[PDB]
Each structure stands twice: as structure tokens, then as C-alpha cells.
RNA sequence: ACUGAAACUGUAGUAGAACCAAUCGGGGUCGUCAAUA
């Protein structure tokens, strides 16, 4: 049992932590037709000047480097390819 | 690539003003009673 966050000494922050049995590792399906990406957490990326950034082409470049592939935007018009929001 | 810290929802405010538990009443006084055979 630990107190976390702001004003944790007062009426705030008391949490119980419990540990579970070691989970199975993620097992994503490798598909060569498309890559789908879901941000489960806020993604912080450096721009190429190492400022933080909001340019998705940098994430495109990052992924295709990290996976050693090449990526292209989904070209249909009745569908959306990208659905990001900025976070500070 | 590392939980901010510290901070009293307190301070002032009369559940009170108004309203008669009251109005009227001599502690008094006279004729029967009963239904049959």
C-alpha cells in the first residue's frame, strides 16, 4: 500500500498494489498486406531536431525503420487512414 | 530517464415577528305516580 501523486500526504493517493502471475507476452499477427497501429499510451517522438513534434511522417519513418519495412498510406477516400490527436 | 512541495470550504448572520385560550351559563327547584277489571 503506497501513496502516489499530488497531495499524497493528505486525503489523496492511497493505493493498494498487487502482483499477478507472469502474463503471456503479446503475440501480434504479422500481416504483409497492412500495418495497423493503435496508441495504447501517449507517444512521445523527437522531431529530427530532437524537439518534440507532431508530424506523423516521422512516425511513419520511425516504424518502417524499426520494423525494416516500407509503409504507404491507405489510399481509399471513403475510409480514413489516420486518426491522431496531439498531446502535451 | 524517476510521484512536486505546501494550502482548514472557511468567514458574518438569534428560527423569528404578531396573536388574551377565550365567549355564553344564579348550584338551581313541586306535583303526583301506576293500569286495570
* C1’ B16 / CA A36, Å: 73
* C1’ B22 / CA A76, Å: 96
* C1’ B15 / CA A12, Å: 39
A7 touches strand B (CB under 7 A): yes
DSSP string spanning chain A? Answer: -EE-STTTTTTS-EE---PPSPPPPP-----SS------SSPPP-B-TTSSB---HHHHHHHHHHHHT--------SSS-S-------
Resolution in A: 2.5
Method of determination is cryo-EM
- The backbone region for A80, taken as left when phi is positive above 0, alpha when psi lies in -120 to 50, beta otherwise, is beta
Amino acid at each position: 500500500t503506497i501513496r502516489i501523486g499530488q497531495s499524497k500526504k493528505d486525503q489523496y493517493g492511497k493505493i493498494e498494489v498487487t502482483s499477478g502471475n507472469s502474463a503471456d507476452l503479446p503475440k501480434p499477427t504479422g500481416n504483409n498486406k497492412t500495418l495497423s497501429i493503435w496508441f495504447l499510451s501517449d507517444i512521445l517522438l523527437r522531431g529530427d531536431r530532437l524537439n518534440f513534434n507532431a508530424t506523423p511522417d516521422d512516425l511513419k519513418k520511425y516504424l518502417e525503420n524499426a520494423l525494416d519495412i516500407k509503409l504507404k498510406e491507405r489510399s481509399d477516400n471513403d475510409l480514413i487512414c489516420i486518426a491522431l490527436r496531439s498531446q502535451r
